[PDB]
Amino acid sequence: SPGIWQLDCTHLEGKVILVAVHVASGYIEAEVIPAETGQETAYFLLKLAGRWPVKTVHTDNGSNFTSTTVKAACWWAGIKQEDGIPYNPQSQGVIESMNKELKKIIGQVRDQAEHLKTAVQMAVFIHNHKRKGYSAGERIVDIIATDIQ
Amino acid sequence: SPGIWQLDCTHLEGKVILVAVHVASGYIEAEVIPAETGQETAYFLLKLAGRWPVKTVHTDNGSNFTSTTVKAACWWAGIKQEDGIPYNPQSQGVIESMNKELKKIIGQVRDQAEHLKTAVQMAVFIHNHKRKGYSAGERIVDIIATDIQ
């Protein structure tokens, strides 16, 4: 569980925001892309795995699970690629509530930024630093350090 | 010390690789951009500060220290923007040796990737996971967790 992440793709302004959530902490990384292709998802997973110790990724949909480009990046980076079936139905609701929270944040910053990508990175910053108290950025570091120890 | 990062800009293939180094661990993040502008540097710092607790950034040159766009991003993200003067001459050599190591790695992967950006993210992954023994990615998590606790 220190190494488990969930992909999530949501849409705004006719663009796609791809998110990776560290399931045990709720810390996220995200980017804006024009569309959700196996090449864009594969590159995003390569970035993520170079920055945190990603053991397993639950893909966001069947097309990213099938994509041989995504499987190729998961092989390269040493990630176990898994499906994203919500056997725990709580997963469905957590993801939905997270997307609604990020879009709320993005609305709150949106007029400080000309481009959507800036607003999404402002929202990643606000989400990860929010204390709910520890923040998600503190929880992720704690969880992984405890694992390393 | 847990919150101190150094920016570094190096060139390959006619493109610019912008790197942020977490000084106490040697962990890095990096990206490829067509050229090193204050807007590109500001967006990179906004990304980095949403992902790790960035207290202080030593800028890589005087143009990024002066840039009001960079200062605007460091204000937004709560980062102290500092110069990059190597008062400890050991700094110069550490950075030069890191750029040579990264280019070495990029060359060892370069033929697995069509685009430079893929090779650079492969190099970030190899650098951060290399055991020298702990890796830089282990050291950064330990350092920050120790600070949090």
Partner: peptide, 8 residues
């Protein structure tokens, strides 16, 4: 293209 980022 036989590359990780372009399998073609």
């Amino acid at each position: 293209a036989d590359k990780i980022d372009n399998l073609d």
